[PDB]
Design a binder for this molecule. Structure first.
Ligand SMILES: [Mg+2]
Length: 280
């Protein structure tokens, strides 16, 4: 079992060593488009770039670049787009990607401000009466409703392509209580949040891939996708104990670098998967 592997790493205090192992084994592919000078103001962090092979291309001829990666998990039959928190100048791009990729849900795992600094542009409208227009990509975004709970908020938004007047309902799942430092004490609220997203259909094959982000779109976002995939595979397989988190993580890392940013995020991911299997 992975509960036994978990208890072993804990008693021997080897989380740091296991995490470094994954870092060393992790795929490395080029990010040539990300690193072009014209795209410098499209990247929040210089050390977080999408691989060319798995990057999400915007459908425009001017500049198709956004810092976003398609993670395609063949066996689990899930896809996810992990991306950075939109910058002041890439909100229109962000919502372009939602539109073009046919996403139903956006999972946001950070607050706009943490540790006294801006981590993310205010990319969605906070009031029904004050809709946003992204002039560069010709999209209108409207808050339709908002349901605030203790650990998360879910918002319904209307995204309209202004060129064609088509509209869609996008669901915004905002986990609002991830601590400024470290990881949650218990994974219970994060699993509950994950189940809410699932229950909405936003992770399902009849929709485009869910868009997941934190500030950089590798740490907390990696945790969400890693836990989700691992749990799905345990449901699907003849032998549930054959699902190795380390292997799933390494497979995900073929599609975007850096997923799971600390040994503590790794530990937490184990905890979340173990507890998730218990409940279900
Ligand atoms: Mg109001």
């Amino acid at each position: 079992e992975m509960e036994k592997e978990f208890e072993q790493i804990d008693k021997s205090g080897s989380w740091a060593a296991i995490y470094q192992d994954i870092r060393h084994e992790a795929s490395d592919f080029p990010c040539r488009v990300a690193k072009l000078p014209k795209n410098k103001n499209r990247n929040r962090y210089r050390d977080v770039s999408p691989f060319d092979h798995s990057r999400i291309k915007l459908h425009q001829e001017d500049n198709d670049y956004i810092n976003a990666s398609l993670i395609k998990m063949e066996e689990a039959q899930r896809s996810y787009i992990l991306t950075q928190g939109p910058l002041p100048n890439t909100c229109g791009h962000f919502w372009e990607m939602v539109w073009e990729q046919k996403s139903r849900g956006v999972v946001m795992l950070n607050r706009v401000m943490e540790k006294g600094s801006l981590k993310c542009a205010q990319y969605w409208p906070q009031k029904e009466e004050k809709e946003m227009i992204f002039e560069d990509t010709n999209l209108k975004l409207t808050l339709i409703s908002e349901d605030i709970k203790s650990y998360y908020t879910v918002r319904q938004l209307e995204l309209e392509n202004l060129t064609t007047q088509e509209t869609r309902e996008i669901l915004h799942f905002h986990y609002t209580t991830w601590p400024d430092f470290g990881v949650p004490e218990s994974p219970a609220s994060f699993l509950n949040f994950l189940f809410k997203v699932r229950e909405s259909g936003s992770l399902s094959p009849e929709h485009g891939p869910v868009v997941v982000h934190c500030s950089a779109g590798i740490g907390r976002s990696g945790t969400f996708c890693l836990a989700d995939t691992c749990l799905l595979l345990m449901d699907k397989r003849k032998d549930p104990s054959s699902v190795d988190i380390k292997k799933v993580l390494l497979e995900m890392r073929k599609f975007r670098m850096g997923l799971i940013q600390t040994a503590d995020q790794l530990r937490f991911s184990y905890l979340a998967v173990i507890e998730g299997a218990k409940f279900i």
